[PDB]
Short mmCIF file of C-alpha atoms and ligand atoms in Angstrom, two decimals:
data_model
loop_
_atom_site.label_atom_id
_atom_site.label_comp_id
_atom_site.label_asym_id
_atom_site.label_seq_id
_atom_site.Cartn_x
_atom_site.Cartn_y
_atom_site.Cartn_z
CA UNK F 1 0.00 0.00 0.00
CA UNK F 2 2.75 2.36 -1.09
CA UNK F 3 1.33 3.71 -4.37
CA UNK F 4 0.48 7.25 -3.25
CA UNK F 5 3.69 7.60 -1.20
CA UNK F 6 5.91 6.58 -4.13
CA UNK F 7 4.21 9.19 -6.33
CA UNK F 8 4.82 11.88 -3.71
CA UNK F 9 8.46 10.80 -3.59
CA UNK F 10 8.69 10.76 -7.39
CA UNK F 11 7.22 14.28 -7.66
CA UNK F 12 9.61 15.50 -4.94
CA UNK F 13 12.66 13.87 -6.58
CA UNK F 14 12.00 15.39 -10.01
CA UNK F 15 11.85 18.94 -8.62
CA UNK F 16 15.14 18.38 -6.76
CA UNK F 17 17.09 17.07 -9.77
CA UNK F 18 15.55 19.38 -12.38
CA UNK F 19 18.02 21.61 -14.25
CA UNK F 20 18.25 24.96 -12.42
CA UNK F 21 20.71 27.86 -12.28
CA UNK F 22 20.16 28.38 -8.54
CA UNK F 23 23.24 26.56 -7.23
CA UNK F 24 25.32 28.65 -9.63
CA UNK F 25 24.17 32.03 -8.32
CA UNK F 26 24.54 30.81 -4.73
CA UNK F 27 28.10 29.60 -5.29
CA UNK F 28 29.32 32.88 -6.78
CA UNK F 29 27.80 34.85 -3.92
CA UNK F 30 29.39 32.54 -1.34
CA UNK F 31 32.87 32.54 -2.92
CA UNK F 32 32.51 36.33 -2.84
CA UNK F 33 31.86 36.44 0.89
CA UNK F 34 34.60 33.89 1.61
CA UNK F 35 37.27 36.01 -0.07
CA UNK F 36 36.07 39.13 1.73
CA UNK F 37 35.78 37.44 5.14
CA UNK F 38 39.20 35.79 4.75
CA UNK F 39 40.86 39.26 4.66
CA UNK F 40 39.33 40.43 7.95
CA UNK F 41 41.19 40.08 11.24
CA UNK F 42 38.66 37.81 12.99
CA UNK F 43 37.51 35.66 10.04
CA UNK F 44 40.83 34.78 8.41
CA UNK F 45 40.32 31.03 8.86
CA UNK F 46 36.69 30.98 7.76
CA UNK F 47 35.79 28.24 5.31
CA UNK F 48 32.80 26.36 3.98
CA UNK F 49 31.65 23.46 6.13
CA UNK F 50 31.52 21.30 3.00
CA UNK F 51 32.84 21.92 -0.53
CA UNK F 52 29.59 21.03 -2.26
CA UNK F 53 27.28 22.28 0.53
CA UNK F 54 26.21 25.24 -1.61
CA UNK F 55 23.24 23.00 -2.48
CA UNK F 56 22.15 22.03 1.03
CA UNK F 57 18.33 22.15 1.32
CA UNK F 58 16.63 22.05 4.72
CA UNK F 59 13.17 22.66 3.22
CA UNK F 60 12.56 19.61 1.03
CA UNK F 61 9.54 21.19 -0.72
CA UNK F 62 11.37 24.44 -1.58
CA UNK F 63 14.33 23.89 -3.95
CA UNK F 64 15.22 27.60 -4.07
CA UNK F 65 15.88 27.88 -0.31
CA UNK F 66 19.56 27.05 0.32
CA UNK F 67 21.29 26.42 3.67
CA UNK F 68 24.99 27.28 3.96
CA UNK F 69 27.42 26.97 6.88
CA UNK F 70 30.71 28.82 7.37
CA UNK F 71 33.16 27.18 9.74
CA UNK F 72 35.85 28.75 11.91
CA UNK F 73 38.36 26.62 13.80
CA UNK F 74 38.86 27.46 17.49
CA UNK F 75 41.94 25.66 18.84
CA UNK F 76 42.23 24.99 22.59
CA UNK F 77 38.68 25.95 23.45
CA UNK F 78 37.15 25.98 26.95
CA UNK F 79 33.46 25.03 27.12
CA UNK F 80 31.38 25.73 30.24
CA UNK F 81 27.91 24.21 30.39
CA UNK F 82 25.21 26.84 30.95
CA UNK F 83 22.71 26.29 33.78
CA UNK F 84 22.62 22.46 33.59
CA UNK F 85 20.99 22.73 30.15
CA UNK F 86 23.23 19.88 28.87
CA UNK F 87 23.17 21.44 25.34
CA UNK F 88 24.09 25.13 25.71
CA UNK F 89 27.60 26.39 26.53
CA UNK F 90 29.73 29.43 27.15
CA UNK F 91 32.93 29.47 25.08
CA UNK F 92 36.09 30.36 27.02
CA UNK F 93 39.67 30.53 25.76
CA UNK F 94 42.87 28.82 26.93
CA UNK F 95 44.57 31.82 25.19
CA UNK F 96 48.19 30.86 24.43
CA UNK F 97 48.65 33.97 22.29
CA UNK F 98 45.91 35.81 24.20
CA UNK F 99 45.50 37.82 20.99
CA UNK F 100 43.89 34.96 19.15
CA UNK F 101 41.87 36.26 16.18
CA UNK F 102 38.62 36.04 18.17
CA UNK F 103 39.89 38.00 21.18
CA UNK F 104 38.31 41.25 19.92
CA UNK F 105 34.91 39.67 20.77
CA UNK F 106 35.82 38.82 24.38
CA UNK F 107 33.78 40.16 27.28
CA UNK F 108 35.64 38.85 30.28
CA UNK F 109 36.90 35.35 29.55
CA UNK F 110 33.75 34.60 27.52
CA UNK F 111 33.37 34.57 23.73
CA UNK F 112 30.50 36.89 22.72
CA UNK F 113 28.25 35.46 20.01
CA UNK F 114 26.26 38.64 19.29
CA UNK F 115 29.41 40.75 18.84
CA UNK F 116 30.85 38.13 16.50
CA UNK F 117 27.65 38.16 14.43
CA UNK F 118 27.50 41.96 14.28
CA UNK F 119 30.84 42.04 12.45
CA UNK F 120 30.20 38.92 10.37
CA UNK F 121 26.90 40.53 9.35
CA UNK F 122 28.47 43.97 8.81
CA UNK F 123 31.31 42.55 6.67
CA UNK F 124 28.72 40.63 4.63
CA UNK F 125 26.34 43.60 4.48
CA UNK F 126 28.94 45.86 2.86
CA UNK F 127 30.46 43.15 0.63
CA UNK F 128 26.96 42.53 -0.76
CA UNK F 129 26.83 45.21 -3.43
CA UNK F 130 30.35 45.40 -4.89
CA UNK F 131 26.33 41.25 -10.72
CA UNK F 132 23.11 40.19 -9.04
CA UNK F 133 20.35 41.51 -6.75
CA UNK F 134 21.64 40.16 -3.43
CA UNK F 135 19.45 41.54 -0.63
CA UNK F 136 19.87 40.59 3.03
CA UNK F 137 17.72 40.66 6.17
CA UNK F 138 18.37 41.35 9.85
CA UNK F 139 15.32 39.19 10.61
CA UNK F 140 15.10 36.74 13.52
CA UNK F 141 18.81 36.74 14.27
CA UNK F 142 20.74 33.90 15.86
CA UNK F 143 20.90 30.86 13.57
CA UNK F 144 20.44 31.36 10.62
CA UNK F 145 22.61 34.42 11.26
CA UNK F 146 22.16 36.02 7.83
CA UNK F 147 19.57 35.37 5.15
CA UNK F 148 20.44 36.53 1.65
CA UNK F 149 17.96 36.67 -1.21
CA UNK F 150 19.38 36.12 -4.71
CA UNK F 151 17.04 37.77 -7.23
CA UNK F 152 13.46 37.17 -6.15
CA UNK F 153 13.33 33.37 -5.96
CA UNK F 154 16.55 32.10 -4.35
CA UNK F 155 17.21 32.32 -0.60
CA UNK F 156 20.46 31.52 1.26
CA UNK F 157 20.58 31.12 5.05
CA UNK F 158 24.16 31.55 6.22
CA UNK F 159 25.15 30.04 9.56
CA UNK F 160 28.47 30.79 11.26
CA UNK F 161 29.94 27.96 13.32
CA UNK F 162 32.94 27.28 15.54
CA UNK F 163 34.91 24.09 14.90
CA UNK F 164 36.64 22.03 17.59
CA UNK F 165 38.80 19.00 16.87
CA UNK F 166 38.95 18.01 20.51
CA UNK F 167 36.70 15.21 21.70
CA UNK F 168 32.98 15.86 21.96
CA UNK F 169 31.68 17.50 25.14
CA UNK F 170 30.80 15.25 28.06
CA UNK F 171 27.02 15.62 27.54
CA UNK F 172 27.31 13.51 24.33
CA UNK F 173 29.15 10.59 26.04
CA UNK F 174 26.06 8.34 26.18
CA UNK F 175 24.40 9.57 22.98
CA UNK F 176 24.59 8.44 19.34
CA UNK F 177 23.38 4.98 20.37
CA UNK F 178 24.05 3.36 17.00
CA UNK F 179 26.04 0.35 18.29
CA UNK F 180 23.37 -2.24 17.43
CA UNK F 181 22.65 -0.68 14.03
CA UNK F 182 25.76 0.91 12.45
CA UNK F 183 28.17 -0.82 14.97
CA UNK F 184 30.44 0.25 17.82
CA UNK F 185 33.33 0.58 15.33
CA UNK F 186 31.45 3.28 13.44
CA UNK F 187 30.39 5.15 16.58
CA UNK F 188 34.08 5.41 17.55
CA UNK F 189 34.94 6.73 14.07
CA UNK F 190 32.20 9.35 14.15
CA UNK F 191 33.08 10.58 17.63
CA UNK F 192 36.64 11.14 16.30
CA UNK F 193 35.35 13.80 13.93
CA UNK F 194 35.25 17.45 15.03
CA UNK F 195 32.20 19.10 16.58
CA UNK F 196 30.64 22.48 15.82
CA UNK F 197 29.13 25.28 17.88
CA UNK F 198 26.46 27.72 16.62
CA UNK F 199 24.84 30.57 18.61
CA UNK F 200 21.35 30.31 20.17
CA UNK F 201 19.48 30.67 23.51
CA UNK F 202 16.91 28.91 25.69
CA UNK F 203 22.73 35.25 27.21
CA UNK F 204 25.90 34.58 25.16
CA UNK F 205 25.66 30.83 24.71
CA UNK F 206 26.51 28.37 21.95
CA UNK F 207 24.94 25.08 20.97
CA UNK F 208 26.31 21.86 19.51
CA UNK F 209 25.74 21.23 15.79
CA UNK F 210 25.83 17.73 14.26
CA UNK F 211 24.59 18.19 10.67
CA UNK F 212 27.81 16.59 9.41
CA UNK F 213 27.23 13.41 11.42
CA UNK F 214 23.63 13.25 10.15
CA UNK F 215 24.82 13.56 6.53
CA UNK F 216 27.43 10.85 7.20
CA UNK F 217 24.89 8.45 8.67
CA UNK F 218 22.39 8.96 5.85
CA UNK F 219 25.03 8.32 3.22
CA UNK F 220 25.94 5.04 4.97
CA UNK F 221 22.75 4.00 6.78
CA UNK F 222 22.52 0.20 6.64
CA UNK F 223 23.49 -2.50 9.05
CA UNK F 224 24.72 -4.25 5.89
CA UNK F 225 27.64 -2.55 4.23
CA UNK F 226 26.04 -2.97 0.79
CA UNK F 227 22.72 -1.36 1.71
CA UNK F 228 21.21 0.50 -1.29
CA UNK F 229 24.20 -0.36 -3.50
CA UNK F 230 21.87 -2.34 -5.77
CA UNK F 231 18.04 -2.55 -5.87
CA UNK F 232 18.00 -6.10 -4.33
CA UNK F 233 19.35 -4.61 -1.07
CA UNK F 234 17.12 -1.51 -1.51
CA UNK F 235 15.76 0.03 1.70
CA UNK F 236 13.27 2.82 2.39
CA UNK F 237 15.01 4.57 5.32
CA UNK F 238 15.82 7.82 3.44
CA UNK F 239 12.38 7.89 1.83
CA UNK F 240 10.71 7.65 5.24
CA UNK F 241 12.81 10.58 6.46
CA UNK F 242 11.68 12.50 3.35
CA UNK F 243 8.03 11.71 4.00
CA UNK F 244 8.36 12.73 7.67
CA UNK F 245 9.97 16.01 6.67
CA UNK F 246 7.44 16.76 3.94
CA UNK F 247 4.49 16.02 6.26
CA UNK F 248 5.65 18.58 8.87
CA UNK F 249 6.43 21.18 6.18
CA UNK F 250 2.96 20.90 4.63
CA UNK F 251 1.34 21.08 8.05
CA UNK F 252 3.50 24.09 8.93
CA UNK F 253 2.34 25.63 5.66
CA UNK F 254 -1.34 24.79 6.07
CA UNK F 255 -1.39 26.23 9.60
CA UNK F 256 0.91 29.25 9.27
CA UNK F 257 -2.06 31.56 9.92
CA UNK F 258 -2.32 30.12 13.44
CA UNK F 259 0.86 29.74 15.52
CA UNK F 260 0.88 26.33 17.26
CA UNK F 261 3.51 24.78 14.97
CA UNK F 262 6.12 27.56 14.91
CA UNK F 263 8.41 25.74 17.34
CA UNK F 264 8.65 22.42 15.45
CA UNK F 265 11.21 21.95 12.65
CA UNK F 266 12.85 19.17 10.63
CA UNK F 267 15.23 18.70 13.57
CA UNK F 268 12.38 17.26 15.66
CA UNK F 269 11.58 14.93 12.76
CA UNK F 270 15.18 13.88 12.07
CA UNK F 271 15.68 13.12 15.76
CA UNK F 272 12.61 10.91 16.04
CA UNK F 273 13.54 9.17 12.78
CA UNK F 274 17.00 8.15 13.99
CA UNK F 275 15.43 6.79 17.18
CA UNK F 276 13.28 4.52 14.98
CA UNK F 277 16.46 3.45 13.15
CA UNK F 278 17.93 2.42 16.48
CA UNK F 279 14.70 0.63 17.40
CA UNK F 280 14.69 -1.16 14.04
CA UNK F 281 18.37 -1.87 13.27
CA UNK F 282 17.88 -4.54 10.58
CA UNK F 283 17.82 -3.69 6.88
CA UNK F 284 15.00 -6.21 6.42
CA UNK F 285 12.91 -3.93 8.62
CA UNK F 286 13.28 -1.24 5.97
CA UNK F 287 12.42 -3.15 2.83
CA UNK F 288 11.29 -0.98 -0.08
CA UNK F 289 8.23 -3.24 -0.50
CA UNK F 290 7.11 -2.11 2.97
CA UNK F 291 7.46 1.66 2.45
CA UNK F 292 3.86 2.18 3.60
CA UNK F 293 4.24 0.27 6.86
CA UNK F 294 7.72 1.64 7.56
CA UNK F 295 6.51 5.20 7.17
CA UNK F 296 3.64 4.34 9.49
CA UNK F 297 6.05 3.16 12.19
CA UNK F 298 7.80 6.53 12.00
CA UNK F 299 4.51 8.40 12.20
CA UNK F 300 3.41 6.23 15.15
CA UNK F 301 6.64 6.81 17.10
CA UNK F 302 6.55 10.59 16.55
CA UNK F 303 2.92 10.70 17.74
CA UNK F 304 3.96 8.71 20.80
CA UNK F 305 6.63 11.30 21.60
CA UNK F 306 4.16 14.18 21.24
CA UNK F 307 1.61 12.49 23.51
CA UNK F 308 4.13 11.61 26.24
CA UNK F 309 6.00 14.92 25.67
CA UNK F 310 9.35 13.10 25.41
CA UNK F 311 11.74 13.18 22.48
CA UNK F 312 15.34 12.82 23.60
CA UNK F 313 18.02 14.58 21.61
CA UNK F 314 19.78 11.85 19.63
CA UNK F 315 23.26 13.04 20.64
CA UNK F 316 22.60 14.41 24.14
CA UNK F 317 20.12 12.06 25.86
CA UNK F 318 19.22 14.20 28.88
CA UNK F 319 17.85 16.94 26.61
CA UNK F 320 14.09 16.57 25.99
CA UNK F 321 13.09 18.38 22.78
CA UNK F 322 9.44 18.11 23.82
CA UNK F 323 9.89 19.41 27.36
CA UNK F 324 7.08 21.77 28.25
CA UNK F 325 9.47 24.69 28.79
CA UNK F 326 10.49 24.29 25.16
CA UNK F 327 7.16 23.51 23.49
CA UNK F 328 3.99 23.87 25.53
CA UNK F 329 1.36 21.17 25.94
CA UNK F 330 -1.17 22.91 23.71
CA UNK F 331 1.23 22.92 20.75
CA UNK F 332 2.04 19.21 20.88
CA UNK F 333 -1.65 18.37 21.34
CA UNK F 334 -2.45 20.47 18.28
CA UNK F 335 0.17 18.76 16.14
CA UNK F 336 -0.92 15.39 17.55
CA UNK F 337 -4.45 15.90 16.22
CA UNK F 338 -3.45 17.09 12.73
CA UNK F 339 -1.14 14.11 12.23
CA UNK F 340 -3.80 11.67 13.40
CA UNK F 341 -6.24 13.32 10.95
CA UNK F 342 -3.75 12.88 8.10
CA UNK F 343 -3.00 9.22 8.85
CA UNK F 344 -6.71 8.36 9.13
CA UNK F 345 -7.51 10.05 5.79
CA UNK F 346 -4.69 8.68 3.58
CA UNK F 347 -2.61 11.90 3.96
CA UNK F 348 -4.34 14.74 2.04
CA UNK F 349 -1.27 17.01 2.39
CA UNK F 350 0.31 14.84 -0.33
CA UNK F 351 -1.85 16.01 -3.27
C1 LIG M 1 14.80 24.01 17.84
N1 LIG M 1 16.13 23.44 17.61
N2 LIG M 1 16.87 23.02 18.67
C2 LIG M 1 18.03 22.57 18.14
C3 LIG M 1 19.05 22.01 19.04
C4 LIG M 1 19.04 22.32 20.39
C5 LIG M 1 19.99 21.78 21.23
C6 LIG M 1 20.93 20.89 20.75
C7 LIG M 1 20.94 20.54 19.41
C8 LIG M 1 21.99 19.55 18.93
N3 LIG M 1 21.93 19.14 17.54
C9 LIG M 1 21.33 18.00 17.18
O1 LIG M 1 20.79 17.26 18.00
C10 LIG M 1 21.32 17.66 15.72
C11 LIG M 1 20.67 16.47 15.37
C12 LIG M 1 20.61 16.09 14.04
BR1 LIG M 1 19.70 14.49 13.59
C13 LIG M 1 21.21 16.84 13.05
C14 LIG M 1 21.87 18.00 13.39
C15 LIG M 1 21.94 18.42 14.72
O2 LIG M 1 22.61 19.57 15.03
C16 LIG M 1 19.99 21.09 18.55
C17 LIG M 1 18.03 22.69 16.75
C18 LIG M 1 16.82 23.27 16.41
C19 LIG M 1 16.29 23.63 15.09
O3 LIG M 1 17.12 23.32 14.13
O4 LIG M 1 15.19 24.15 14.90
ZN1 LIG M 2 19.60 1.50 2.42
#
């Protein structure tokens, strides 16, 4: 009973892969900012998080909204957990040449995020005009730090991130519970990769970012090493993630006039999806023939998290994404009812 879901997926895939000049405009704008930022005193080591991440799309229904991350390496960094929040940190410096590039943003021993953004934004804001109609926005703030608009259609969220090649902070030690699915060998390898810090609040605090580990898992997602390398070992994991993402997006669109869904994002959906991967580690539990059932397991688990108001961060297990101080009871109950409506009516949002 997959026929409608496949067609949704087919429609979505054709609009992703269709010939477009968007990635080209985005890349020339970004190479522009990278040259300009590289000449400034604080941003001399700035670089793209991934060569080829010009075409990173958070919104899976909008192929002209691009998501771009700029990375800056902070060697010998001192993290201090903020207010037992497990996920938010002050950045301090071990300062060996106490005039490290970032020192001009120090207030006390503490790295200021808002000051760093002000100059990042100001450098970008002036570099914007000296080709194309690149407009920016001081909207929202935080992360995304800067949203550019190329012409009318194309939109580029730029996020600035600190990179640390030391071992991941102690709040991750019992997370990424992939041992029964991707193996303990692979968990070790992943935790040997650097971690990233972006600004956000719940003061001058930073938050862990793991989009690179997510990408890595999704590009090597099977218990079997040959998963999805032919169509005989073809699994529906990635397609379920797509259908989860698209369902929230269409509900966020349908109900934008109200407000109850403003706090949910694809991060809540990704997180719940990887928990289901842990719960179902076998590739035979993700057979393409069973797309319909497999999607339904994801939708069932997410609804269970909403109803119990528990969805543990996949990397930091003491952090509850659905805690009532983060999203109130009336918002989860609202999203609970819309998803149950969709499931019981063979998903009208997919039309
Ligand atoms: C509302 N909100 N809160 C966060 C957030 C808060 C604390 C800690 C992390 C840690 N990060 C992850 O758990 C993570 C997981 C996956 Br899977 C992929 C990338 C990731 O960074 C994220 C992100 C968003 C949002 O984006 O709206
Ligand atoms: Zn697969």
